[PDB]
């Protein structure tokens, strides 16, 4: 991060970067994992699961909010699509 923020001002560690490096830090740097158990949980994808179980709360919050504000069906109006179909196949 100290190297990259000299390239551009924005260029900070994301929270999606920081949870990744801090969770590998937790796994292969606390106890209870060897380096073939900690790296197997990374190769399998146990860092997908953190983002999924987190974002399920926000998804169900969006569901309950869209039901409680009682909105009807969304349609996505036709001036946002720009159909690009071929000529005559």
């Amino acid at each position: 991060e100290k190297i990259t923020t000299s390239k551009k001002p924005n260029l900070i560690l994301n929270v999606d970067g920081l949870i990744g490096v801090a969770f590998v830090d937790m796994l292969r740097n606390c106890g209870s994992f060897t380096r073939e158990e900690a790296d197997e949980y990374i190769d399998i994808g146990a860092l997908n699961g953190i983002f999924v179980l987190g974002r399920s709360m926000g998804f169900i919050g969006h569901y309950l909010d869209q039901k409680r504000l009682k909105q009807g069906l969304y349609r996505h109006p036709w001036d946002d699509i720009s159909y690009v179909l071929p000529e005559h196949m």
Partner: protein, 65 residues
């Protein structure tokens, strides 16, 4: 008794029906006539529950039940 002053600058209405275009025009008229409140307090449509519609008081957005 039939009144003689039907409308005023404090006249409040309920429009019956789903008429977002016409009630948009009416709230546009309430804004452009320099009125304090909208002329429409509520809408009544029997096929839909109570919610709030968003409208433009100039640029600001308000909610009408």
């Amino acid at each position: 008794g039939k009144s003689t002053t039907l409308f005023s600058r404090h006249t409040k209405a309920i429009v019956w029906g789903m008429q977002t275009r016409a009630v948009q025009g009416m709230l546009d008229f309430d804004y452009v006539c320099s009125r304090d409140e909208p002329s429409v307090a509520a809408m009544v449509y029997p096929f839909t529950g109570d919610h709030k519609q968003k409208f433009y008081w100039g640029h600001k957005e308000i909610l009408i039940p």
